[PDB]
Design a protein around this ligand. Sequence first.
Ligand SMILES: CCCCCCCC/C=C/CCCCCCCC(=O)O[C@@H](COC(=O)CCCCCCCCCCCCCCC)COP(=O)([O-])OCC[N+](C)(C)C
Ligand SMILES: CCCCCCCC/C=C/CCCCCCCC(=O)O[C@@H](COC(=O)CCCCCCCCCCCCCCC)COP(=O)([O-])OCC[N+](C)(C)C
Ligand SMILES: CCCCCCCC/C=C/CCCCCCCC(=O)O[C@@H](COC(=O)CCCCCCCCCCCCCCC)COP(=O)([O-])OCC[N+](C)(C)C
Ligand SMILES: CCCCCCCC/C=C/CCCCCCCC(=O)O[C@@H](COC(=O)CCCCCCCCCCCCCCC)COP(=O)([O-])OCC[N+](C)(C)C
Ligand SMILES: CCCCCCCC/C=C\CCCCCCCC(=O)O[C@@H](COC(=O)CCCCCCCCCCCCCCC)COP(=O)([O-])OCC[N+](C)(C)C
Ligand SMILES: CCCCCCCC/C=C\CCCCCCCC(=O)O[C@@H](COC(=O)CCCCCCCCCCCCCCC)COP(=O)([O-])OCC[N+](C)(C)C
Ligand SMILES: CCCCCCCC/C=C\CCCCCCCC(=O)O[C@@H](COC(=O)CCCCCCCCCCCCCCC)COP(=O)([O-])OCC[N+](C)(C)C
Ligand SMILES: CCCCCCCC/C=C\CCCCCCCC(=O)O[C@@H](COC(=O)CCCCCCCCCCCCCCC)COP(=O)([O-])OCC[N+](C)(C)C
Ligand SMILES: CC(C)CCC[C@@H](C)[C@H]1CC[C@H]2[C@@H]3CC=C4C[C@@H](OC(=O)CCC(=O)O)CC[C@]4(C)[C@H]3CC[C@]12C
Ligand SMILES: CC(C)CCC[C@@H](C)[C@H]1CC[C@H]2[C@@H]3CC=C4C[C@@H](OC(=O)CCC(=O)O)CC[C@]4(C)[C@H]3CC[C@]12C
Ligand SMILES: CC(C)CCC[C@@H](C)[C@H]1CC[C@H]2[C@@H]3CC=C4C[C@@H](OC(=O)CCC(=O)O)CC[C@]4(C)[C@H]3CC[C@]12C
Ligand SMILES: CC(C)CCC[C@@H](C)[C@H]1CC[C@H]2[C@@H]3CC=C4C[C@@H](OC(=O)CCC(=O)O)CC[C@]4(C)[C@H]3CC[C@]12C
Ligand SMILES: CC(C)CCC[C@@H](C)[C@H]1CC[C@H]2[C@@H]3CC=C4C[C@@H](OC(=O)CCC(=O)O)CC[C@]4(C)[C@H]3CC[C@]12C
Ligand SMILES: CC(C)CCC[C@@H](C)[C@H]1CC[C@H]2[C@@H]3CC=C4C[C@@H](OC(=O)CCC(=O)O)CC[C@]4(C)[C@H]3CC[C@]12C
Lengths: 610, 610
Amino acid sequence: SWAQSRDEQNLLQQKRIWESPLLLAAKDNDVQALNKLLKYEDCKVHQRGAMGETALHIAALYDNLEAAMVLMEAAPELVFEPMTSELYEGQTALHIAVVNQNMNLVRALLARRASVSARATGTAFRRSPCNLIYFGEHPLSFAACVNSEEIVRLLIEHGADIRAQDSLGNTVLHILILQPNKTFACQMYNLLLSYDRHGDHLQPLDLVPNHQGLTPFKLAGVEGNTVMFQHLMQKRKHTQWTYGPLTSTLYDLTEIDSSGDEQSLLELIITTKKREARQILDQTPVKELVSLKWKRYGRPYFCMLGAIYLLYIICFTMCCIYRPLKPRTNNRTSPRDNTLLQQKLLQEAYMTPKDDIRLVGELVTVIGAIIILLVEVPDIFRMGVTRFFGQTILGGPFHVLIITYAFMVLVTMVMRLISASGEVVPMSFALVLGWCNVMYFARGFQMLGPFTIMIQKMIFGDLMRFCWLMAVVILGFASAFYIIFQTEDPEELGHFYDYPMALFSTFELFLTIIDGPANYNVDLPFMYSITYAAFAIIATLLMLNLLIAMMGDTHWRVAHERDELWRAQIVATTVMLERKLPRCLWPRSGICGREYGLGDRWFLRVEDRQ
Amino acid sequence: SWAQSRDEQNLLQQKRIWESPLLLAAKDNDVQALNKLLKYEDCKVHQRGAMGETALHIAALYDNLEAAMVLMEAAPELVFEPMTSELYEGQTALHIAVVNQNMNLVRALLARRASVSARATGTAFRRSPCNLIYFGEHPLSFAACVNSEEIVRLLIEHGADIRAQDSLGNTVLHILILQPNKTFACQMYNLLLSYDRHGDHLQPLDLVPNHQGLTPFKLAGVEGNTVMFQHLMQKRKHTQWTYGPLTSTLYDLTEIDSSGDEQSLLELIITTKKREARQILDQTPVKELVSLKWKRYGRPYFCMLGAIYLLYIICFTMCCIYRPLKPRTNNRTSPRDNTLLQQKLLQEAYMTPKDDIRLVGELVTVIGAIIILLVEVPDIFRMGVTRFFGQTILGGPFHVLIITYAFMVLVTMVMRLISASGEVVPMSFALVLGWCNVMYFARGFQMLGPFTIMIQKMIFGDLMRFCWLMAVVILGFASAFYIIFQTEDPEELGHFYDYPMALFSTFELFLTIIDGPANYNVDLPFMYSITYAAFAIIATLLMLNLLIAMMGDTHWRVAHERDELWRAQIVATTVMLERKLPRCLWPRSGICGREYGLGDRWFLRVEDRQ
Ligand SMILES: CCCCCCCC/C=C/CCCCCCCC(=O)O[C@@H](COC(=O)CCCCCCCCCCCCCCC)COP(=O)([O-])OCC[N+](C)(C)C
Ligand SMILES: CCCCCCCC/C=C/CCCCCCCC(=O)O[C@@H](COC(=O)CCCCCCCCCCCCCCC)COP(=O)([O-])OCC[N+](C)(C)C
Ligand SMILES: CCCCCCCC/C=C/CCCCCCCC(=O)O[C@@H](COC(=O)CCCCCCCCCCCCCCC)COP(=O)([O-])OCC[N+](C)(C)C
Ligand SMILES: CCCCCCCC/C=C/CCCCCCCC(=O)O[C@@H](COC(=O)CCCCCCCCCCCCCCC)COP(=O)([O-])OCC[N+](C)(C)C
Ligand SMILES: CCCCCCCC/C=C\CCCCCCCC(=O)O[C@@H](COC(=O)CCCCCCCCCCCCCCC)COP(=O)([O-])OCC[N+](C)(C)C
Ligand SMILES: CCCCCCCC/C=C\CCCCCCCC(=O)O[C@@H](COC(=O)CCCCCCCCCCCCCCC)COP(=O)([O-])OCC[N+](C)(C)C
Ligand SMILES: CCCCCCCC/C=C\CCCCCCCC(=O)O[C@@H](COC(=O)CCCCCCCCCCCCCCC)COP(=O)([O-])OCC[N+](C)(C)C
Ligand SMILES: CCCCCCCC/C=C\CCCCCCCC(=O)O[C@@H](COC(=O)CCCCCCCCCCCCCCC)COP(=O)([O-])OCC[N+](C)(C)C
Ligand SMILES: CC(C)CCC[C@@H](C)[C@H]1CC[C@H]2[C@@H]3CC=C4C[C@@H](OC(=O)CCC(=O)O)CC[C@]4(C)[C@H]3CC[C@]12C
Ligand SMILES: CC(C)CCC[C@@H](C)[C@H]1CC[C@H]2[C@@H]3CC=C4C[C@@H](OC(=O)CCC(=O)O)CC[C@]4(C)[C@H]3CC[C@]12C
Ligand SMILES: CC(C)CCC[C@@H](C)[C@H]1CC[C@H]2[C@@H]3CC=C4C[C@@H](OC(=O)CCC(=O)O)CC[C@]4(C)[C@H]3CC[C@]12C
Ligand SMILES: CC(C)CCC[C@@H](C)[C@H]1CC[C@H]2[C@@H]3CC=C4C[C@@H](OC(=O)CCC(=O)O)CC[C@]4(C)[C@H]3CC[C@]12C
Ligand SMILES: CC(C)CCC[C@@H](C)[C@H]1CC[C@H]2[C@@H]3CC=C4C[C@@H](OC(=O)CCC(=O)O)CC[C@]4(C)[C@H]3CC[C@]12C
Ligand SMILES: CC(C)CCC[C@@H](C)[C@H]1CC[C@H]2[C@@H]3CC=C4C[C@@H](OC(=O)CCC(=O)O)CC[C@]4(C)[C@H]3CC[C@]12C
């Protein structure tokens, strides 16, 4: 609906240029007709186009130097005119000649005092998925993104402000990081810092943030721009000595490490959705910083929490095993009734010293369930209650499973206080969610770490993508199997005696975890052998080994990038383990340079061999 | 804790150089300030640094030739000064200028009679995982490891001892093998043998061992340095004739083959932990030596021991089958009691001539169990009782299984002598350990050989790495399944009737080796169908085919290097079969050159075609 509208304006621009002889003579290189048109009476010079454009805009848009000079002589006030549309707001011909890199025509307008500070605020210039270029809003921003070193020098001599910000707060150094040609953006980055030295108006140009707060150093890590990230560490490192093939380099760790309350560079890479940002983790000062925090304070504090959680789940498991049960007080209803025991009442549950030992174990699992919710739930109140916490749901799925576990413990606490029947259903969820959260503590081991990335990408990328075709085949054949055996005696072959059982039987015959139905003492119905032969070929052979072959490719892809997926689990673990543990037991990383004559900041030394 | 300490000294070195004007003028190339400082009164010349360094140490460390010459004129006694720290003990500036390769400044110190024999015994020079360079302790050792042919010639002219040894006993030829650039180390190896000819003080420089006993020939094979190993066989081979495209080369086999009581080169490659050393086995005189020892005396003596072991295990199997059993004398306790027979007493066991035939077979399996322990156990007494024999445990795991088998035979010997109940548990271990040791004798066949390397790397690299996540899922769902059926009648569905059975049932439902529980005559509990549907998706589909896909990659990696893993099993078999068989039936390999005019050593001839 939006691409349909701006295709209708680009064809309407071409109709207006074919109707007006003034606009048509500016498209072609026709100075013969522009002499004849402009010598007429009043000429209709300031007429609009379909884009709100003037005739001097067309001459700069089609690289017509000779047509533009005729218009500037005959009408000198066309230079100060912006486009008055919606999709090209504020754009002048001084914007257009910069992008088309017409060196003779930029000097021509600036001789006629063209504005170097007009703001091209149209929707064909905002950072959008619909726009193929994001150049900024200023002509100095336009010339930097087209790699024109001659015009960037020529604009600053005429007064182009280098510290100007667009609607996103981005300076020209922020926009050069967002450009697709990364090697040419490094040379233009150096050139724009050569001119920023003049009596600093605030903190310098590479230290000015945008409306997100990011500096050009932190923006290169959020956007995954690894080429610019290496280029901006050269300002931040410092070589101490060089002993033959040795080199001792001292790195900054100011905007990388967690200085204060702001988000550090490690927090912004884990949070962001662009998965190109996780290549910053392989770059040198960040790579030895993560290994330093994990081997010193990360891994000891993580293996303590993993061992306290095992003793909690073993204490929870034995309270479910020794739960209060008594023989049933009523009598059996049907011959299909299998039940022999039922739950004791609350006053009846605690009446012996062995129930007092269990009550100690039940208070441990209730208090531990509250401590989980005191740590996890106040994060949804600080962050956004639905959306901005839902970003952490797709990031860490073990946040959900331990809040759901702690919910299930307090449900069967309430169902114990009031004497409620059916505590087996909140317990059974809590046993399997309680134990399968021990697979969270497998990222402390590099070999066991990305096994849970395999289990995740097989469920949410293979099973949740192919089970819609399996459920189609189960519903087809279970409905067939149900009406075949609908006229029969279930006491011989009872796999399909009602419709919910025929769906659970066909799910189990799909996966080949119960045997195929057979009696051999009675004549089975005729359609059964034909249907089950057709079922066993498409379900058990073909579609079951489809899924096993799909999951075998998910295994191969995760095991290939086995090292860089584990080291991104450690950054997410170390960052989480700082924002919840108190500061007195987490020392700050690196060597502080107060009593070494280096300032107030916190350095990190790397020694290598070339 | 150790890297944190020597980061604090490298920043403290930079503070002391910024405080003293004498040290700061030696870091920069400032001969203007060194003229003004040294013309003062007493100047504080011999002040220390944070590394125990002098001002003449800084000038050599930062490549300041002009700053160093001012210091040597004004203070000529700074040349004889070592660093008095702990981490740079004994290092002088004559060490530093050699590593930085400053040719003008090495001649300057040696003109002022600098010591060419000072020992840099600091912990930044010991062979350690923490040190990135191991250059030795002498300036001749430093110049050889930086590939400076001009300084090695210049040091020997001033009296550098070429036979000097560091704290590890390594000469300069030992250290050149330990260097990472292998091609440049070959040219420096040749240069240092050109100077060692002067009236040999002992056996020559390439034949002097270190405190481990290794010569530079044997050190290249232990360290896996295959480039230096080819370069040092050129001294050891000898071309007999060249008949067109043919060439007859006669190889040495002095330090390669088992000469006396010392460990040969074949014994040191199998023993060592660096698995780069097994590429020496593909090099020509070692490769045809292993094939010669195996095809002549290795494989006949190995197939005799494999056939005697089959007849021993078949004789052990029939003594377990015909074991003494009688009907039970007591009466049944419970309806769950299944037992119908029990063991006979010792006086009752041997009372017929068919028991006398078994007694012959039981003496064979007792005597054979003692002979295993007389061969295997006295190896743990000669080697280190815990640690240095534990190196052979990780090397050969079939040493453990045949000592454990021989232990299990003598347990049920003792349990037969005293009439002890429960001989089925030491026998059942001994049947499966007895028969699965026949897979030891599968390396005699090249096709069957590395099948047991597959079985090993799947157990100790896939199963012992993923079963911690399976046991989490088994304990989760077996605890869920136990409390679901805890209120039921076990006589219909008894898979989970107590907690140890529910763990063995869930282990068997994981692996899909028993069928899923179903009755269809009774109403099963409601949570069972939901839990077993969740179990059968994550356990049987997803996590069971994870492990099968992991083991499929272990198969692919071992089958790729199928030839070089079998030929390393033959070296370990041939070496083991020499140190236990007597010398009269193992002839020495090669042709001895006594009556061929070649000396006392033992050659091996290889004929090839180019
Ligand atoms: C990888 C590392 C390895 C892990 C290994 C770890 C150990 C793993 C194994 C552990 C034990 C396994 C065997 C024990 C079985 C006997 C229990 C018992 O006697 O039950 C009694 C009740 O007791 C209960 O009801 C249990 C309640 C929870 C116990 C915790 C109490 C407070 C601990 C506070 C702090 C907790 C932790 C704090 C968390 C921060 C009564 O039962 P019974 O009448 O005697 O029944 C006997 C039946 N039988 C005769 C057939 C047997
Ligand atoms: C990926 C997930 C998909 C799940 C797939 C499997 C679903 C599993 C869900 C299981 C939930 C079970 C809850 C309790 C069941 C009781 C009610 C019942 O269903 O049976 C009732 C029957 O009534 C029916 O026949 C309903 C089935 C209609 C067609 C199926 C539509 C399913 C939605 C399609 C979605 C499309 C998805 C794929 C397309 C994109 C009563 O059973 P009865 O006792 O035998 O009474 C017979 C009376 N008689 C004796 C007179 C004859
Ligand atoms: C790849 C190569 C292929 C391998 C092939 C090799 C051969 C493989 C097969 C071999 C034989 C298989 C069939 C034999 C079954 C009859 C045995 C018997 O009669 O038992 C008798 C007792 O005998 C015993 O108790 C056995 C004790 C050990 C025997 C060794 C005696 C001393 C040998 C010293 C040196 C040993 C070696 C030294 C080691 C260095 C009594 O039993 P029974 O009352 O008669 O029971 C009959 C029941 N039935 C009627 C139903 C049947
Ligand atoms: C890789 C290897 C791992 C193996 C995993 C599987 C272990 C296999 C080991 C099997 C050994 C079995 C030996 C004999 C069993 C008898 C005692 C018993 O356990 O049952 C007793 C129950 O008491 C319990 O419930 C204990 C279980 C507590 C929680 C499990 C902790 C396991 C350690 C976690 C380690 C974490 C490792 C993963 C995390 C990294 C008695 O049973 P009962 O007769 O039914 O009495 C019920 C009384 N009732 C009737 C009143 C209700
Ligand atoms: C699916 C579930 C499976 C996963 C298990 C989850 C359940 C249990 C969770 C976690 C396990 C808890 C028990 C520890 C056992 C392993 C420890 C170990 O050997 O690691 C290191 C020793 O440790 C260190 O060198 C540094 C840490 C200090 C010791 C840990 C402190 C507390 C230990 C307990 C005191 C508790 C205090 C409170 C008392 C209750 C060895 O070095 P590594 O380098 O780490 O070697 C392998 C990693 N690698 C592959 C990277 C090379
Ligand atoms: C009380 C018990 C229930 C409640 C407890 C908590 C339950 C919920 C737990 C965790 C929920 C936390 C969020 C989901 C986790 C990952 C989602 C994600 O990352 O994006 C995913 C899409 O997006 C989705 O698929 C969203 C999930 C929709 C279905 C949720 C129900 C599945 C329950 C689970 C039951 C499943 C049946 C298994 C057997 C039972 C993409 O996945 P990916 O990993 O980013 O990459 C894989 C794609 N790739 C392969 C192409 C590369
Ligand atoms: C999991 C278990 C499976 C493994 C079986 C373990 C159990 C039994 C253990 C070992 C097997 C014992 C029986 C021998 C059968 C095979 C012999 C053979 O054919 O090999 C060679 C013949 O042999 C030779 O050419 C040289 C050796 C002389 C013959 C062996 C002497 C003793 C034979 C018995 C007298 C006993 C004396 C004491 C009396 C008791 C053939 O040449 P090859 O080159 O080797 O061909 C294949 C190898 N390749 C792939 C490299 C090309
Ligand atoms: C009486 C009956 C019991 C006693 C009899 C004797 C029992 C003990 C027998 C042989 C023991 C001899 C030493 C182990 C052999 C190999 C170890 C090794 O090489 O290093 C290993 C690590 O290091 C370890 O894992 C050490 C082993 C720890 C567990 C030991 C108990 C397992 C028992 C066994 C039961 C398992 C369950 C199976 C079904 C039962 C590394 O393995 P790798 O091969 O070097 O390379 C593979 C890694 N790769 C794939 C990444 C490349
Ligand atoms: C009553 C007493 C004796 C028992 C103590 C209970 C502990 C076992 C609980 C209390 C708080 C719990 C912690 C609360 C929050 C978290 C964060 C949680 O983080 C995630 O799940 C990250 C998700 C992801 O990144 O995928 C991991 C478990 C952990 C450390 C919990 C581990 C278990 C703890 C220590
Ligand atoms: C009583 C019955 C009906 C309960 C049903 C249990 C399931 C709903 C639970 C139990 C096991 C759980 C799984 C166990 C482990 C994982 C791996 C876990 O992996 C990650 O989060 C990887 C990400 C990372 O670590 O980087 C994602 C959730 C998931 C699939 C869990 C999803 C929810 C599952 C299937
Ligand atoms: C495609 C691969 C997996 C195998 C290829 C062979 C199949 C197509 C063949 C092998 C056995 C055949 C079946 C053998 C016997 C029967 C039973 C017959 O039905 C009855 O006699 C019903 C019994 C009754 O009415 O009591 C119908 C054909 C059918 C299913 C045959 C269908 C074709 C089958 C499955
Ligand atoms: C009483 C009489 C009639 C029976 C003879 C008993 C033999 C069958 C036994 C006695 C000593 C045993 C040997 C003792 C030691 C070894 C070394 C052993 O070496 C390893 O296991 C290497 C381990 C590895 O490299 O993995 C292999 C079996 C072998 C030859 C044994 C094979 C079986 C032997 C010959
Ligand atoms: C009665 C029951 C409980 C006994 C249990 C038996 C297991 C503990 C045994 C029987 C089979 C054995 C395995 C059989 C064969 C091998 C291959 C073997 O492989 C090698 O040593 C390869 C190295 C090489 O040859 O180069 C290592 C031991 C291993 C895994 C064994 C380990 C111990 C196992 C699992
Ligand atoms: C993911 C792939 C492997 C298959 C995708 C389809 C499944 C998600 C569907 C197919 C059959 C369905 C089951 C069909 C019948 C039942 C029984 C129903 O429980 C009962 O009726 C219990 C019986 C009783 O209480 O007596 C609960 C839903 C459940 C487990 C369904 C859960 C969803 C299942 C497993």
